[PDB]
Design an enzyme around this catalytic site. Structure first.
Site, PDB file in Angstrom:
ATOM      1  N   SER A   7       0.789  -1.226   0.000  1.00 60.87           N
ATOM      2  CA  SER A   7       0.000   0.000   0.000  1.00 60.87           C
ATOM      3  C   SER A   7       0.821   1.276   0.000  1.00 60.87           C
ATOM      4  O   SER A   7       0.232   2.349  -0.170  1.00 60.87           O
ATOM      5  CB  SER A   7      -0.988   0.026   1.174  1.00 60.87           C
ATOM      6  OG  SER A   7      -2.017  -0.922   1.000  1.00 60.87           O
ATOM      7  N   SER A  41      -6.024   3.602   3.842  1.00 56.67           N
ATOM      8  CA  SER A  41      -5.506   2.509   3.018  1.00 56.67           C
ATOM      9  C   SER A  41      -6.618   1.746   2.303  1.00 56.67           C
ATOM     10  O   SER A  41      -6.522   0.531   2.102  1.00 56.67           O
ATOM     11  CB  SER A  41      -4.573   1.573   3.794  1.00 56.67           C
ATOM     12  OG  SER A  41      -3.590   1.100   2.890  1.00 56.67           O
TER      13      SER A  41
END
Length: 261
Positions: free
Chosen positions: A43, A103
C-alpha cells in the site's frame, strides 16, 4: 556500534530482509541499508497514485471534485471507506483521502482506473525522475509480495527520494503539495510503525503498507521540533508466504536512525 552496525544487527535478529533509507534534509546526508534493492511496495504505492491525480488537478480545476460512482462490484478486500458509499459517489479528492488515510483498496483501484491503469502510475513516477518504481497490478493482487518478483516494487532510496520530492520538493505545485502533506499527516494506520519509534510529539506524515511474505512497510516525512525534516523509508519482508507482519521492526529501525536528531 555505528548506525550501520546497528541496522545490520537489527536485520540479523529480524528473520528477514530490511531496507532503510533516511534523508536528512539539513545537509542531504543519508543513512542507507539495502537501499538499491527491490521490495514489494504494497500500500505504500497508494502515495504515487494519489500524487498522480494531484498532478492532473494542477491543470484541471474541476478534477478533485469530480464524482466517481462506487458500485458493489468495485469492492475488494479492505475498503472501510468505499463500502460506506456503495450506490453513491465519492469525489476524486475523497478517494485520495480514503486511499491514503485509511488505506482503502477500492479507493486505490478507482484512482488507478481514473489514470488509465497501473502503467500510468509508473509513467507519473518516471516523470518525477524515479527510474525504479513500477506499478503493474491493481488491488488486491499488487500485494502478493513474492520474493524476487519485480512487479509492484521499488527500492528504499528511490522511494525516499521521490517522497521528498513529492512532499518537500519540486514534484507538485504548492496547493497540491500541501494537500498531499495534509493527507499524509492525517494517516490513521501508522501508529505502531515508524511513528512508534519517534518522539511522540514529532509531527509525522506517513503511508503504511503490508502484504504477503510478512511484507511490512512504511514511508514517512518527519518534522522535528528544532530540526529540518527527515524523510524515512522502512521496508521489510520475510521468506515465508504466511509470515506475520512486523511493524515493530519498522519502529525499531526508525528509533535507530533518528537517534540524535
Amino acid at each position: 556500534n555505528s548506525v550501520q552496525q546497528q541496522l545490520e544487527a537489527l536485520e540479523k535478529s529480524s528473520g528477514g530482509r530490511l531496507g532503510v533509507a533516511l534523508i536528512n534534509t539539513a545537509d542531504n546526508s543519508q543513512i542507507l541499508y539495502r537501499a538499491d534493492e527491490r521490495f514489494a511496495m504494497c500500500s505504500t504505492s497508494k502515495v504515487m497514485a494519489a500524487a498522480a491525480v494531484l498532478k492532473q488537478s494542477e491543470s484541471d480545476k474541476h478534477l478533485l471534485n469530480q464524482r466517481v460512482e462506487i458500485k458493489k462490484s468495485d469492492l475488494v478486500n479492505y475498503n472501510p471507506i468505499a463500502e460506506k458509499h456503495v450506490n453513491g459517489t465519492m469525489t476524486l479528492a475523497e478517494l485520495g483521502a480514503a486511499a491514503l488515510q485509511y488505506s482503502d483498496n477500492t479507493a486505490m483501484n478507482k484512482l488507478i482506473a481514473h489514470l488509465g491503469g497501473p502503467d500510468k502510475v509508473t509513467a507519473f513516477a518516471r516523470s518525477l525522475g524515479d527510474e525504479t518504481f513500477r506499478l503493474d497490478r491493481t488491488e488486491p493482487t499488487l500485494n502478493t509480495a513474492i520474493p524476487g518478483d519485480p512487479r509492484d516494487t521499488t527500492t528504499p532510496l528511490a522511494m525516499a527520494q521521490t517522497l521528498k520530492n513529492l512532499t518537500l520538493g519540486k514534484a507538485l505545485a504548492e496547493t497540491q503539495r500541501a494537500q498531499l502533506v495534509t493527507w499524509l499527516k492525517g494517516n490513521t494506520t501508522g501508529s505502531a510503525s515508524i511513528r512508534a519509534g519517534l518522539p511522540k510529539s514529532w509531527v509525522v506524515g506517513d503511508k503504511t503498507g503490508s502484504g504477503d511474505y510478512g511484507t511490512t512497510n512504511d514511508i514517512a516525512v518527519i518534522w522535528p521540533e528544532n530540526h529540518a525534516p527527515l524523510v524515512l523509508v522502512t521496508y521489510f519482508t520475510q521468506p515465508e508466504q504466511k509470515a506475520e507482519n512486523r511493524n515493530d521492526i519498522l519502529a525499531a529501525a526508525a528509533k535507530i536512525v533518528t537517534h540524535g536528531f
